[PDB]
Paper text:
Many S protein alterations, especially in the receptor binding domain (RBD), characterize these variants, e.g., the N501Y mutation in B.1.351 and the K417N (or T)/E484K/N501Y co-mutation in the SA and Brazil variant. However, the natural K417N, E484K and N501Y mutations changed the binding sites of BD-503. The K417 was not directly interacting with BD-503 while the K417N can be recognized by Y33 in the heavy chain. The E484K mutation broke the interaction between E484 and Y102 in the heavy chain of BD-503. The naturally occurring N501Y mutation disrupted interactions of RBD N501 to S28 and Y92 in the light chain of BD-503, and also caused a slight shift to break the contact of RBD G502 to Q27, G496 to Y92 and Y449 to S30 in that chain of BD-503. These changes may account for the reduced interaction affinities of BD-503 to RBD-E484K, RBD-N501Y and RBD-501Y.V2. Our data showed that Y489H and RBD-501Y.V2 mutations caused more than a three-fold reduction of binding affinity to all five VH3-53/3-66 antibodies, and thereinto, BD-604 binds to RBD-501Y.V2 with a sixty-fold reduction in affinity and binds to RBD-Y489H with a nearly a hundred-fold reduction. From the structure and SPR data, we found that the F486I, Y489H and 501Y.V2 mutations obviously affected the affinity to most VH3-53/3-66 antibodies, arousing public alert to the mutations on these residues.
Residue numbers in the entry:
A (entry chain L): 1 to 214
B (entry chain H): 1 to 132, 138 to 219
C (entry chain R): 334 to 527
The structure:
Amino acid sequence: DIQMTQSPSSLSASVGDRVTITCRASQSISSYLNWYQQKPGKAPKLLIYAASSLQSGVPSRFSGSGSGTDFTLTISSLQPEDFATYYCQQSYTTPLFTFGPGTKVDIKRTVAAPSVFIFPPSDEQLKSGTASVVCLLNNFYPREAKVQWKVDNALQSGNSQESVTEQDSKDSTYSLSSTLTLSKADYEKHKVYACEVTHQGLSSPVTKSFNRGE
Amino acid sequence: EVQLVESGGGLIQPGGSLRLSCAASGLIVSSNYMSWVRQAPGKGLEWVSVLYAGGSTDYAGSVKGRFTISRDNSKNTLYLQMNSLRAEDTAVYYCARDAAVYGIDVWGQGTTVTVSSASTKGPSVFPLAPSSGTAALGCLVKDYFPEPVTVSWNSGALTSGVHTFPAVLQSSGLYSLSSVVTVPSSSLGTQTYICNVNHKPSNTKVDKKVEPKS
Amino acid sequence: NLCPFGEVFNATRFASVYAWNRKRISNCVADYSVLYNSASFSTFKCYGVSPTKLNDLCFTNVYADSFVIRGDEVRQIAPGQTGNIADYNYKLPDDFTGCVIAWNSNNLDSKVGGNYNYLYRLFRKSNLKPFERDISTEIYQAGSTPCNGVKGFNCYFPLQSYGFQPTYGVGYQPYRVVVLSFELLHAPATVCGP
Ligand SMILES: *[C@@H]1O[C@H](CO)[C@@H](O[C@@H]2O[C@H](CO)[C@@H](O)[C@H](O)[C@H]2NC(C)=O)[C@H](O)[C@H]1NC(C)=O
C-alpha cells in the first residue's frame, strides 16, 4: 500500500503570488500522480494528470512537476477563485488509488490576535442537568490557535469540542468556538472556570475566566 | 454533457440498507473503470470500490462483504448497494470515472449518506449572555439531529459581526452549534438581540432573546 | 536430446505480459527436479500435479508461457484470479493443471531512469478467455463516439509501461514469470522423464 503525504497542511497566499504545493509518495511511483482542486461543498476537479500534463480546460497557470517520490503543483499567478484545497493522487496502483491528505490555500492577511470571551452556562441549561461553557476566539488570523480549559486550575482533557469558521469574506479572519461540557453536579463542585488561548498574534497566553457565583 | 448524476442518499439506521445510483452521459459505464469514493465530514477522499470494464470488482478493506457495486448497461448507470451500514459509513459518496493514468477526470455531484441511531430532535436554545468597547453575545443551539440548522439574528436586520459556527457531532450522536455576534457595549441595555433558530427536520422554530445577566 | 528449458528460463529478453511468449515443448526428455531444486525461485506453485512427481509423468505437449510483471502482480497468475493482468493480459483456466514459476529479475529488467520496454494492457472492454492473447494497439473507445486513431478524451492508448527502475520497491520490481502447462490428449505423448 502506497501512502501519500502533502507538506503544508495549510499555507497562505495573496492574489498574483506564486504558490507551490508538494506531495510525496512512500515508494517511487514515477510519474503516476494527479492533482485535484476541491472547493467547500463541490466535487473534486482534475488539474494535472501524469505529473505534468495539463488537463483540458484548466487555466494555463497550473503546472505539475516531479518524478519518483516528490512532486509539485505550482500556480504561476494565484487568482481569486483559486482559494481551495489541493489534493494529490497516485495512479500507480490503478484502479485502487490513494489520495493525499490535502493542502488548503487561504487568503493572506496581516496577523490579528483573537478577541477572547468566555460564557458561563445559562441558568436554564442548568435546569436540564448539563453545563455548557463556551470560549470564543473572535476574528483572528492565522487559523492556527490553541485553547486550554482550566477548572480550578486543573487542565481539562477529554471533554471539550472546537469548531472553526470559514475564512471571512471581508475580514479574512477566522473565529473559533470551544465548548466544555460538564454535569451540573460536577460544575457546582468547582469555582474557577478559565479559557487560556495562545496564538501567534498574542505576546503571552491570554486567559479569560469567571467564578461560579458571578 | 459529460455528467454523473448521483441519487439515493439520505438517513438510515445502523444495520440498514441504501442503494446509491450514478446515471451517466457522455461515457459508457460498461467500458470504464467506475469507482465509488467517499469523503467523511472534515476528512478527505477515501476510495471505496471499483467496477472494471470486464466486470471484476474490488473493495476497500472496510466495506468488503457489506457493499456490492454493480451496473445496468441498459440505463447506463453505476450502482452501489450498501448493506449493514455502520456509523463510520457516514460521508458523501462520489461516483467517478477512473481514467487511470489520465486522471479521475469525471466526477458525480455527490450524495450524502448519514448512518445514525439518533432519533431526530429539535434543538435547545440557551443564551450566550454578554458580560460586564465591544461586547460579544450569542446563542447556543444544543442537542439536535439531523442536520441542518440555520440561524439568523433580529429576523435578518442583524448581519454584521455575526458568526454561526459549523456544528459538531457530540458523543451522544447529536449535533450542536453556537452562533455569536459582536455589538456595541453601549447598545446592551437599549437594543434587543434575538436569535432565530430554524430546524426544519422537526418543524422547530425558536426565537430566544439574549439579555445581560444580573 | 532433452527439452529446451534453457532456451526459456535463461533467455536474455522476456516478452511483455500483454504479448506473452509461448514455446511448444515436444519430443524430448525433461528434468523437472533441476528446476524445483534450483532454489533460485521466488514462487513455484503447481496445480493439479505435484512438482516432485513431475519427472515420473509423460505428456503429449508441454507449453511454456513466459513474460514479465510487477511483484504484487505475480498473485494473479493463478487459477481464479481477477485484476488488470489476469483480466486483460493473461488468464489461466479454472481447471488449470501446470506450474507457475517466478523469480526476481530486477538485476536485468530494471534500468536506471526507467525501463520503458515492458508493457501491459491497461484498458480493455471484456475479460480474456484462458490463454487468449490481445496484441491490438487500437485506441480504446471509452465513450459513445469513435476515436479514429486520435488519442484524447474517452480515447486512450491501451498499453502503459512499467517504470522498472532498480530503485523501486519489492513487490513493485520486475519479476519474470514462466507458466508451464501440461496437456494430455489422445495422441502420442512425447515429453517424459528419464
Ligand atoms: C540456467 O543457467 C545456469 C547457469 O548460468 C544453469 O545452472 C547450472 O546448471 C548445471 C546443471 O544443472 C550445474 O552444474 C551448475 O551448478 C548450475 N549453476 C547454477 C548457478 O545453478 C541452469 O541449469 C540453467 N537453467 C536451465 C533451465 O537451463
